[PDB]
Amino acid sequence: SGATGERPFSDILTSIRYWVIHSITIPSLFIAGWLFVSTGLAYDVFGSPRPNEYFTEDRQETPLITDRFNALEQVKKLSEV
Amino acid sequence: KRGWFDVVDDWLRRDRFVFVGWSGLLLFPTAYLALGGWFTGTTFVTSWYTHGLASSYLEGCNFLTAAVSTPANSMGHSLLFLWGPEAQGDFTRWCQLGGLWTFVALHGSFSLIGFMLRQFEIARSVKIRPYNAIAFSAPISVFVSVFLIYPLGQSGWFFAPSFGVAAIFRFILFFQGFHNWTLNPFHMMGVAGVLGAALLCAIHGATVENTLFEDGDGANTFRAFNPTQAEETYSMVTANRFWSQIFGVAFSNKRWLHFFMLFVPVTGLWMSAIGVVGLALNLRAYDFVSQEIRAAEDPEFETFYTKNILLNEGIRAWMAAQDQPHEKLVFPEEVLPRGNAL
Amino acid sequence: GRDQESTGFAWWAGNARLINLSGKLLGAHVAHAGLIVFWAGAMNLFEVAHFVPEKPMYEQGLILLPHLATLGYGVGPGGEVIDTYPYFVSGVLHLISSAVLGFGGVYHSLVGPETLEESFPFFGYVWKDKNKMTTILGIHLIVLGLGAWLLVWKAMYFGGIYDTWAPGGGDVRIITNPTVSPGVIFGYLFRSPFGGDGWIVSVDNMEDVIGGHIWIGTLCIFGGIWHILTKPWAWARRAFVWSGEAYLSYSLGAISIMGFTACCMAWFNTTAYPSEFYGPTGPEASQSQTFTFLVRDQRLGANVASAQGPTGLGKYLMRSPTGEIIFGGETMRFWDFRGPWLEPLRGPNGLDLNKLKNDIQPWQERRAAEYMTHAPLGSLNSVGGVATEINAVNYVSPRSWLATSHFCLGFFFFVGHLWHAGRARAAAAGFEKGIDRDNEPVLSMRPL
Amino acid sequence: MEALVYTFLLVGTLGIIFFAIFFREPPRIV
Amino acid sequence: ESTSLWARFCEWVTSTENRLYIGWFGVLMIPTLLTATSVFIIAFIAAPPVDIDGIREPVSGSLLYGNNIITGAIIPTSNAIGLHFYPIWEAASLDEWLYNGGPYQLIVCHFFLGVCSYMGREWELSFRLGMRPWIAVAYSAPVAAATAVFIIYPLGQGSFSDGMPLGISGTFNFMIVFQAEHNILMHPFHMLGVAGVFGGSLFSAMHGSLVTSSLIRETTENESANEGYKFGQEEETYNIVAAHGYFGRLIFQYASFNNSRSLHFFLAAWPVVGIWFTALGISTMAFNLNGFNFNQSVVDSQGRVINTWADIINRANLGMEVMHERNAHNFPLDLA
Amino acid sequence: LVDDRLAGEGTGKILGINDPSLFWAITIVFTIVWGVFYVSTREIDAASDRENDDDFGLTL
Amino acid sequence: KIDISKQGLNSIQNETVKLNLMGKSKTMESKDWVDPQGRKGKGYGVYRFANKYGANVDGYSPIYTPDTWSESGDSYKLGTKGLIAWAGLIVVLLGVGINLVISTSALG
């Protein structure tokens, strides 16, 4: 009972303006996420190994970080292509 | 003229669609980051370098197998800050190092504090008793004991539960194999609390819906109600007599019934949290020495407890090599315990 | 249609508005019948279109084609599928029939009369009319009897039925002497459901199956005629709630039993569910494993008869707790299993050591080898093998699908009995809408 | 000894159930 | 008015003036549950070791044979018996019957009839008291779970030895082996079951706390707030609008049940539906339709397998599988 | 053999009747209970304050 | 009490929907009304205490009140001029989006 002085969601989701605006904003966000993975940017931003670089000529087994204070150096070696 | 605290207090505690409050200055920032940390980690961050596993959708995991995995065991109990000595500001290397787990665990733990404060702040403004906040203490004890206290007693964050569906299952199976957590009397009380609360939830819901008063002519009995009505919507006298003749004992006090529905679940989770605190130090109720000494003296004595001990031997040996890569265990096949044939 | 304003039933209980609308209720039942026929045709065509002869039926996830195979369509000796056209015409015939069934359901629901009583007295009914209800029960009981006679007509006069126990190898066989003796028929009905007996699931030859469906066809026709010419007696009128929802609950309870029986039929029976089409049963695969290793170890040189396992019991052969010689190991539990491949090697005392040592035919070894690798074990995402398997084989047994699905349906329809029956009594007594505040029954009762 | 103490605890718990059902405080209206 | 013996007997059976309601389901519930209860108590205290695996290796489960309360159990029937009906009279002696696990079949069979009759007895009292039905429908959820672990799972697996042992440590062995052979954790129905009990535990705490937080002041601070409620009160003991105002502001207004009748249906539907599915999960896994198997699902470009958390779960399953029933298997595949 | 047993388990007997004495037990008990039920039917129905005619019965 | 006319339910076009949202039902109000299962109503409406309290849960706290809706939402101010511009932009961005997906893929 009673409203907090904000437009009812039903009013907004039935209005033409909302769909005219979100018919572009929502699809653009979807394409933006698609291009993030398609372009490979995600692999380079979060450091996830592409399906062809889990194992390296030198390392044919799983990596193992051993040095805590040299982890930045060690992870770069283990992640080195 | 009004002071700053009063002006801000006015805006923070405005009656809007989503209440902010003072506690929101802690809840919403931290809660968003913890939510964002889990989604980002389970979607793009890998566990290849901390666990030798794939745990992101990008790598090819489902919702069931994706997780935000714990840091490597060499990191110990490092807080793994973005600016910390392990990864010094290198965000992509920070994600590979498992620093996103501590991000979610730390910002997430403060969101739990922020939420309990939100319950206290809203309860005081509405002018009602603060029992919901006292209840939410039980989920907080579970989170604190399991995700924080338990790894703090172990080698490092590596042995904390990773934020994932299958990752939690590994954590659950780890506790059986290494701690015999089922045999622990504190998980037993916690199980009774959760199963007892689920029983109470179903019985109370069913009993109320089946002792409703006829306050209308429609078969849809949901509509024959008003929140502001003075009359009770169901017959407590009829409900009491039903369970007194079916079960022998029934509630006669409605206030006592609801406090009980709150006490069972909270007490259960709190007892479990005590047991996990014990497991942090490996103070586990792993075995009954009297039965183990007996079984060692006659090869005929068999109990289901001794059969579980043999199952734990299999779990530890067959899981350790991959579950704990830092140990560098190279167990040859002949040394792993296995029964005849299968 | 209607609304909650004029009915008191919300949209989520909307079909409850059809209880007293005979014409619209008729359309609903005719329309759902069209849905059932549609699925049978649509899945029959789907399974045919996705069928390859390089693999057996049970490897391709087919559950309808094995039913047609057991009726002796498109199969040859040994269970080989020789033709697929009979499966195609069956699928088309159902698919087209659903269209006319859907039209009648759509017509009788939207356009047809809302109630059939005034315009069509023959079809009009009121639930409280015990006589009219038994006539409808009697009529639809006869059409069930005729359906049962179609099965015996096909097995005796139209091509025959697939007999997996047939001499000379399993094949389509015309039944000529169905077992109609009362002792045999009553023997299945009143034997225990426990192991070794298995209630009606233990029917082990097509003479009994056809002889049984002769009894059902005759009982239903007589029962149909009886329930048409009579009305419920005094003891029946005082023992049942005579309302629409009560009749529904009676069927929900009965259909619940059938669902559980089908679940056990698909899991255990190897006669009406031949393993050539539905794959091996759980017991069959376990027995097949010990048979496979016994054959291999005998060839590698070993007296399987006297080979002692680690526990002291026979490794390959032991005695059942009644004395029969059975396969050893954990398969001891499945010593009741009887299959067309192992029975030839089974004398009156159990397995024959001489037969198991000198007279095991290669087709028997091939059958057992195939069955042990297609055991009903599998995963929800259809990965064959135990839970500790790897993603290599895409297989779940049709028996596993049939047993699991029709148990879930069977259980939910038992809750249907509990729900729709508790409400039928409450609605009839008059307190399904709640306790009356004016005269609460407990208040009149003396304190406990 | 343990077997005696386990049985007394179990039958003791069962004895409480009997009294809680039959020798209970009766619920009285007003 | 009632003069006939049967008329007088049927009036006594259906009487609502009995301390505990007997019913027509009660004439089935009481003898079956008393039979199962008495045999359970005798067998739990002093029953000889039972050969459960059929490999002539007796397993002790009674207090008088060196078990405590936690490890004591009623051992399931011998694997040699299988699904065969093994009453007392089918045994040459009680010593043979005890050796082969006879009490388990006796207890389970009479217990299954007892809980089914207990479910019917719950409906019957409601009809006599003029209440609505479907308390028994809610009780069908735990009944389904009991039949799943005691009746259906032995049915699918082909032996009562695979039923859940009637003990605390016996239960844990049943669960561990179940994970090894069916991967129940990855089954979507144990997931819905866990959501049922975690959700039910959550909703029990939320409902209890919200009602306790909105109690109308009717006592003093030197007495329990429970004193404020008098048995048979016509008026409400707590303010529903006050509790809705708090919960509708803790999250947002339309995530709260201002309808007390809708709230209690949700309180009943959520755990019952959850336990219905987990009961179906055990029933389905009785016919070897196991949980999700994602082993070696992630592979790299050259064909190497990249392990996931599912593969770590598999290694635990391998440990349990090879160690459960050590002396019972002669052949590699655990088909039985 | 060494000892004696009923040897009826797993033999598919109707109602588990290995010997006719079991048949008499079931028949005698049922007939007695049906007998006391039969003589009381009229009284049980009279309470309904209605005759057990074709319209009798809890109906909706 | 509660005035149903001030609950924002006065502009529902379909009277049946308007009555459902108000928690009122003229048909069920009659004492000669018969439930679709044969039960005869006792005289109450949807709620027997509607007169004492004003309404049911439905009237007390509706979740669909078109009266409170802003009048500006009824029409699109930019009209067909903004609508054709929307249609033109949708096509242009659709083509660009498809080109980007194809260009950045490993297609072919």
Ligand SMILES: CCCCCCCCCCCCCCCCCC(=O)OC[C@H](CO[C@@H]1O[C@H](CO[C@H]2O[C@H](CO)[C@H](O)[C@H](O)[C@H]2O)[C@H](O)[C@H](O)[C@H]1O)OC(=O)CCCCCCCCCCCCCCCCC
């Ligand atoms: C909350 C809701 C709960 C719901 C519970 C529902 C459970 C579903 C099961 C039963 C209940 C539904 C009603 C009956 C359905 C049919 C059950 C049935 O066809 O029953 C039999 C089936 C299958 O039986 C199997 O039948 C098989 C037949 O195969 C044989 O014959 C086949 C055909 O040729 C093949 O040749 C095969 O190789 C050969 O071995 C074997 O004989 C097996 O040994 C035998 O176990 O399932 C069985 O085994 C059942 C075993 C007995 C039941 C389990 C114990 C229950 C005990 C209750 C109290 C005790 C006694 C009273 C019970 C009943 C009183 C009337």
Ligand code: CLA
């Ligand atoms: C409610 C807000 C809030 C809270 C409570 C936290 C809390 C936390 N964050 Mg987080 N964070 C937040 C918002 C918040 N954050 C926001 C909005 C962002 C940007 C999106 C981040 C981004 C972020 C990252 C990237 C990281 C953290 C991390 C952490 C954890 C430890 C690191 C730390 O706190 O530094 C040190 C502790 C303090 C600074 C506390 C001291 C506060 C004193 C009182 C300040 C005194 C000011 C002083 C006088 C100087 C004045 C300067 C100027 C005003 C003149 C910790 C639990 C780290 C982590 O997750 O660990 C793995 C991490 O790496 N946060």
Ligand code: CLA
């Ligand atoms: C097997 C499923 C099934 C069937 C056969 C029916 C049948 C029926 N329902 Mg029902 N219903 C169902 C499921 C079903 N329902 C479910 C799941 C719900 C929950 C949402 C409901 C909720 C519900 C309510 C609330 C009501 C009904 C009502 C009705 C009756 C009349 C509908 C009407 O006249 O309005 C008209 C509907 C339409 C005009 C929609 C047109 C769509 C057409 C009919 C579908 C045809 C599509 C198909 C491809 C064409 C085949 C043509 C053929 C020649 C090839 C009718 C007999 C009403 C009633 O009780 O009558 C008094 C009513 O109030 N139902």
Ligand code: CLA
């Ligand atoms: C789906 C089919 C169906 C349905 C719904 C009904 C329904 C009904 N029947 Mg009917 N009946 C049927 C089939 C059916 N019958 C058939 C096929 C026959 C021919 C045998 C009969 C013969 C028949 C007679 C003679 C009578 C009824 C009567 C009744 C009414 C009383 C219900 C009752 O008390 O039964 C409940 C059942 C019992 C109380 C006893 C339980 C016995 C069952 C069957 C278990 C035994 C199992 C075993 C395999 C049966 C052996 C039978 C043998 C021939 C194989 C009821 C409305 C009675 C009536 O009202 O007269 C009009 C009546 O006296 N029926």
Ligand SMILES: CCCCCCCCCCCCCCCC(=O)OC[C@H](CO[C@@H]1O[C@H](CS(=O)(=O)O)[C@@H](O)[C@H](O)[C@H]1O)OC(=O)CCCCCCCCCCCCCCC
């Ligand atoms: C189950 C078998 C025994 C198992 C024993 C196991 C020990 C644990 C359970 C017993 C202890 C807890 C009970 C507490 C009783 C209570 O609070 O209510 C008090 C009860 C209620 O009755 C009174 O009766 C009053 C009537 S009058 O006033 O007496 O007339 C009436 O007002 C009302 O009912 C009440 O006030 O008062 C009594 O009269 C009960 C008698 C005293 C309790 C006896 C305890 C010992 C039992 C036997 C032990 C030996 C067992 C072996 C037998 C061979």
Ligand SMILES: CC1=C(/C=C/C(C)=C/C=C/C(C)=C/C=C/C=C(C)/C=C/C=C(C)/C=C/C2=C(C)CCCC2(C)C)C(C)(C)CCC1
């Ligand atoms: C009442 C109603 C309802 C329902 C309804 C229904 C259920 C209906 C159904 C209907 C139906 C049930 C329909 C069907 C149809 C079918 C058809 C129409 C068919 C066709 C065929 C064709 C077209 C052809 C094919 C082919 C062949 C010939 C061979 C092969 C190839 C092919 C496949 C191509 C509802 C719910 C909505 C609600 C409202 C009311």
Ligand SMILES: CC1=C(/C=C/C(C)=C/C=C/C(C)=C\C=C/C=C(C)/C=C/C=C(C)/C=C/C2=C(C)CCCC2(C)C)C(C)(C)CCC1
């Ligand atoms: C086809 C075939 C067969 C079979 C046949 C037959 C002949 C069947 C039948 C069956 C029958 C013939 C029957 C069944 C069942 C029945 C039942 C199941 C019953 C029911 C009823 C009831 C349960 C009751 C109810 C009521 C009364 C009246 C009493 C009281 C209570 C009440 C009211 C509820 C065989 C196997 C040979 C082979 C194969 C195939």
Ligand SMILES: CC1=C(/C=C/C(C)=C\C=C\C(C)=C\C=C\C=C(C)\C=C\C=C(C)\C=C\C2=C(C)CCCC2(C)C)C(C)(C)CCC1
């Ligand atoms: C951490 C990090 C960051 C942040 C981030 C954030 C803050 C956020 C994000 C956030 C987010 C927020 C994300 C999200 C995502 C989402 C998603 C991904 C969704 C999903 C969903 C789905 C998938 C659905 C499902 C469903 C259900 C539930 C029901 C039924 C139906 C369906 C099935 C549909 C920063 C910069 C601070 C720095 C540090 C690091």
Ligand code: OEX
């Ligand atoms: O018994 Mn109880 O656990 Ca069902 O799997 Mn086979 O058997 Mn034995 O092994 Mn695995």
Ligand SMILES: [Cl-]
């Ligand atoms: Cl084996």
